[PDB]
């Protein structure tokens, strides 16, 4: 919330919530944070094709 949450991004995996955070007064990079149904949270590549697929299937 007050610094960057994502240093690295997921390689090759499988849903629930996806927060698209634009750079702000505390972080300089775009962070795509996915909250799963499983409860777990993940960092995803904003330019990734699997990402653009999920944010749309939800929309």
């Amino acid at each position, epitope marked *: 919330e*007050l610094r960057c949450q994502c*240093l690295q991004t*997921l390689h090759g995996i499988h849903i629930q919530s996806v927060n698209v955070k634009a750079p702000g007064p505390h972080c300089a990079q775009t962070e795509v*944070i996915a909250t799963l149904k499983n409860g777990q949270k993940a*960092c995803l590549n904003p330019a990734s094709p699997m990402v653009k697929k999920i944010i749309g299937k939800m929309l």
Partner: antibody
Amino acid sequence: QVQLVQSGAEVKKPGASVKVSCKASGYEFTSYWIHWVRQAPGQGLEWMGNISPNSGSANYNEKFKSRVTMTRDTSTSTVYMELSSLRSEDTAVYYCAREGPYSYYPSREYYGSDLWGQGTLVTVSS
Amino acid sequence: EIVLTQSPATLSLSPGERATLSCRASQSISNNLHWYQQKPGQAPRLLIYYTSRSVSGIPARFSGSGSGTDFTLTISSLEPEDFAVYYCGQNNEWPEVFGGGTKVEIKR
């Protein structure tokens, strides 16, 4: 060997620029954030900013934003700190430090800066 | 921005004694408060991370505790190599902020 090796001491003239390097060794370069923290003679520690060794996305202290630029070279596993418009007040020992490891899993709980370089003295004098 | 206040500025003790160091945050920094040691001519060395967690290579005599806005570093029994400067550093938000330091001096 798990190391952070920095460039040598620098003597710079007021108004000039300095570029300090930090070479990562014996670990996953991509897994740790790299910070730049300076210490003026006889003073405390001041954070200048950091860089993501993957993206090269850098974050800066607003006090140094306008004069500082951090960059990385993945091929050499090195990070750089460039400070511009040097003043007497910039005479300090500049340290690079790593914070992590971190993956694609975000957390509300952070590690500390567990590994520091040997430091780089930068002297601003005519 | 965050202001970490270290107390006291100087701590005068003898080897074998217990050392207790304070760090007070201006506002909540959750538990993202870390402790570092600094010897003359050397880089700061991390002792305790995330208020109370252990660090590889750090002796058992070192421990930390805290209550969200107030933190403590405890050195159980002082060894000669423990006389140095100690900083507390927050990394909950950016910019990272450090306290003024506490010098642990030999008492005489």
